[PDB]
């Protein structure tokens, strides 16, 4: 599984609007961000063009794809509690 991925988009270290506000759009994981989709989601009230192009490099810099559903996610390296 891609380690990043597996981060949340708040931690993912991109930009402030975009993993931030992939965080308050539900997506607290950058998993969920790839199996979601840029279409809508580059057109709320409070994101941008600019981020789509972040989302976008990473959606492309670990091999995946819009709305790319994950494997069974989340994975099992979030089993501590």
Known sequence: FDPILLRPVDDLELT???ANCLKAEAIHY???L???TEVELL???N???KSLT????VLASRGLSLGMRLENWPPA???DE
């Open 77 to 79: 390296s979030i089993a």
């Open 30 to 32: 950058i998993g969920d």
């Open 16 to 18: 402030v609007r975009s």
């Open 43 to 45: 057109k709320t009230p």
């Open 54 to 57: 972040e989302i976008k490099d």
């Open 47 to 49: 994101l941008g063009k």
């Open 34 to 36: 790839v199996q979601r």
